[PDB]
Write a protein that binds this ligand. Structure first.
Ligand SMILES: C[C@H](CCC(=O)NCCC[N+](C)(C)CCCS(=O)(=O)[O-])[C@H]1CC[C@H]2[C@@H]3[C@H](O)C[C@@H]4C[C@H](O)CC[C@]4(C)[C@H]3C[C@H](O)[C@]12C
Ligand SMILES: Nc1ncnc2c1ncn2[C@@H]1O[C@H](COP(=O)(O)OP(=O)(O)CP(=O)(O)O)[C@@H](O)[C@H]1O
Ligand SMILES: Nc1ncnc2c1ncn2[C@@H]1O[C@H](COP(=O)(O)OP(=O)(O)CP(=O)(O)O)[C@@H](O)[C@H]1O
Ligand SMILES: CSC[C@H]1O[C@H](O)[C@H](O)[C@@H]1O
Ligand SMILES: CSC[C@H]1O[C@H](O)[C@H](O)[C@@H]1O
Ligand SMILES: [Mg+2]
Ligand SMILES: [Mg+2]
Lengths: 380, 378
């Protein structure tokens, strides 16, 4: 007999009980319940099947919970201070029991509120360098890594990213969602064949480049923050993909916040972009020196060319994220809450244009500061 | 445990239990290596092959990859692979079409056979097999499952070490004449070539593009004047599209190095033709049968073919070097006489392989590859 039962606030306290109080459901979306239990505190997250499930949704099994639990556990073996601790998980119940982080704030929300989070990029850069290194062929015996590829195959969730990030914003597809005022600019994109060919190439990398175990959806809404703490949450999109992907998505979301700000307010976000590349690069390099298994690791120029490839892919993926968050199905609050309406349109236009240029020019940039300086000029 | 090692009577008992004959037959073990049995079974008033893996240490799971890979290949190019009548994982057995009327390509090629259709046939094999198991042809969710199904860790381990790693360092698996050492050490001390061998290996390790054959040499092919059959896909897994292309082209070049003068021309025609045909076939499949919205944007197919080509050339360079000084050699080079000419031709294998790896992205056409090779081997 099937063990899956949808939890309530009472059921959740019963479960925490049987794994040796007050409870409130505090979830943000409609695809998961998140139960906060207080005595010492705890979070119990449970996936909600299609099916139902209140309100329109993308149809998904509850297998995503197995990916998220196991992804979070793997991340905590390398960066235990940058992810919530997991106390229990169960794939049939689709349950992850984890550390309570409600004394922190979702990074996106704080950034929109004008919080600057001075260590956000230091922490995310460390998260990125260590997670992305330690699950690759550089760090792992290839036989071990090939099994981890099987274990983290993520078809349904990859299908979402393949469509939404890499495909739908580039044609007149039904999932797109944009203001009519934006159409002339959106059609410029659709008729641009050379950027579309490059989008195809970045997609093919996404589809085929099993380089490391990625988070797969590292935006500012998937991170908890305060002045001194950062915690990366919700790796439900985890699978073996290109190292540059998580880096690009994060960097794109820093730039998306910068577009929603004005003038000298933007400067903290530009420092965060510069710092997250800088830190990602030292962290990845330190891990490579100290912990690489291949005979080729210490040949002068090999780490350098590896970093150049990651950088190029990361900028291309960033451009995809910039564009897709502006005109695709899933938007960001940074842009959608800009006031007045005409200013919102103008900044949405600039997201499309800087995304396009990121994609096109990815392999011409030599440093992160090149990326920032191109951005600033395009958004003057 | 079910597995039992077959003998000649045991094999005939198997064939009859599958109803593939009928009832009087004869059987002889005819296997080349010592890691598999191959039983030929014949009927007066029809014939059959039963291949069985026997437990460099390797599990018998390779037999499940071989069967499955052979079956997948026959869905697209049934005329270019042996038919499979039965397979079983526990017994590690593939029952297949008898191809004893044909000759192993490498052996014919060394004897001086020219096989005029070999490259046309391999080109079609390569274009179709490599297209039709990729994301271009398959729903991504379907492809992701096939990646699991063909994960092949042990055999990929052999390739990772032998083609991509050991020839480039003073490693214990290497095996070469002492007279060749100065040239071998030129390679070990060459950083920029090794950095590039590293990149090609990283592609091998990470680039899950299609279901490849993974060991497409001239000894994995049966030939005659009119027929070609690709055998033994035991190394099959999801890897870079250019790999099987490089390994085959390198193996044509290796035979060229074992021939002299005008006798080399057939192999050069084969190299040009295998690329041409691989490219025409892959393109026709892409036009007719690609699933992505991006397939018909002008320049995309072209850029895709340019990347395949570049990788294929780099993988060819690796194969040339690896077969000359690593553990597993080729008879083309090892049987060249006199000893001194053999060493000189093995030197040219190392140097043409090195150039292929380093220049892979500078060549514009297959003709540039052939012309560079001809020049270096003058
Ligand atoms: C003008 C500012 C300097 C900022 C500053 O000085 N502060 C900079 C520094 C990075 C530069 C870009 C990249 O190089 C890539 C690319 C190379 C081509 O060649 C020309 C176009 C393009 C997009 C460049 C343009 C311009 O050159 C940039 C934006
Ligand atoms: N460990 C934790 N501690 C405290 N609150 C948490 C928490 N995990 C989740 N939450 C609360 O629940 C909200 C939703 O969390 P989460 O992003 O994991 O859910 P979700 O996966 O259903 C959303 P989506 O569909 O956007 O991916 C958070 O923004 C937060 O307020
Ligand atoms: N389908 C077939 N029809 C006729 N003979 C066949 C055959 N398959 C294999 N053989 C015979 O068996 C020999 C060895 O076969 P094969 O190359 O498949 O085995 P193998 O995998 O044991 C070799 P290796 O271990 O070197 O890769 C061939 O060279 C051929 O003479
Ligand atoms: C159907 S899910 C839409 C988006 O939400 C997730 O966070 C991913 O970013 C996905 O693209
Ligand atoms: C240890 S096996 C050596 C070689 O034989 C196979 O045919 C492959 O080419 C492998 O590299
Ligand atoms: Mg979620
Ligand atoms: Mg074999």
């Amino acid at each position: 007999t099937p063990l899956y039962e949808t939890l309530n606030e009472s059921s959740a306290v019963a479960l925490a009980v049987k794994l040796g109080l007050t409870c409130q459901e505090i979830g943000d979306g409609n695809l998961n319940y998140v139960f906060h239990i207080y005595d010492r505190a705890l979070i119990i997250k449970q996936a909600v099947p299609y099916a139902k499930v209140v309100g329109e949704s993308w149809p998904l099994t509850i297998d995503r919970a197995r990916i998220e639990s196991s992804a979070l556990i793997r991340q905590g073996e390398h960066v235990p201070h940058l992810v919530p601790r997991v106390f229990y998980s169960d794939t049939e119940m689709a349950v992850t029991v984890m550390e309570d982080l409600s004394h922190l704030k979702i990074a996106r929300k704080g950034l929109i509120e004008g919080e600057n989070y001075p260590h956000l990029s230091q922490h995310i850069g460390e998260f990125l360098g260590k997670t992305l290194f330690y699950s690759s062929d550089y760090a792992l015996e290839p036989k071990v890594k090939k099994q981890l590829v099987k274990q983290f195959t993520n078809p349904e969730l990859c299908d979402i990213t393949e469509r939404l990030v890499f495909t739908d914003p580039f044609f007149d597809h039904d999932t797109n969602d944009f203001e009519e005022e934006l159409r002339p600019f959106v059609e410029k994109l659709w008729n641009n064949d050379s950027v579309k060919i490059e989008a195809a190439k970045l997609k093919k990398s996404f589809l085929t480049s099993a380089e490391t175990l990625i988070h797969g959806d590292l935006h500012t809404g998937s991170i908890f923050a305060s002045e001194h703490e950062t915690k990366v949450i919700d790796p439900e999109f985890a699978f073996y993909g290109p190292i540059g992907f998580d880096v690009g998505q994060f960097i794109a979301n820093l730039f998306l916040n910068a577009l929603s700000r004005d003038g000298a307010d933007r400067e903290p976000l530009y420092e965060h972009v510069n710092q997250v590349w800088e830190t990602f690069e030292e962290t990845f390099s330190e891990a490579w020196q100290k912990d690489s298994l291949d005979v080729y690791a210490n040949i002068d120029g090999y780490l350098t060319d590896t970093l150049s490839h990651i950088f190029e892919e990361a900028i291309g993926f960033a451009g995809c994220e910039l564009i897709r968050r502006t005109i695709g199905l899933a938007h960001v609050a940074d842009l959608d809450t800009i006031v007045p309406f005409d200013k919102r349109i103008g900044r949405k236009r600039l997201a499309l244009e800087t995304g396009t240029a990121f994609i096109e020019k990815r392999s011409e940039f030599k440093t992160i500061t090149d990326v920032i300086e191109l951005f600033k000029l395009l958004v003057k």
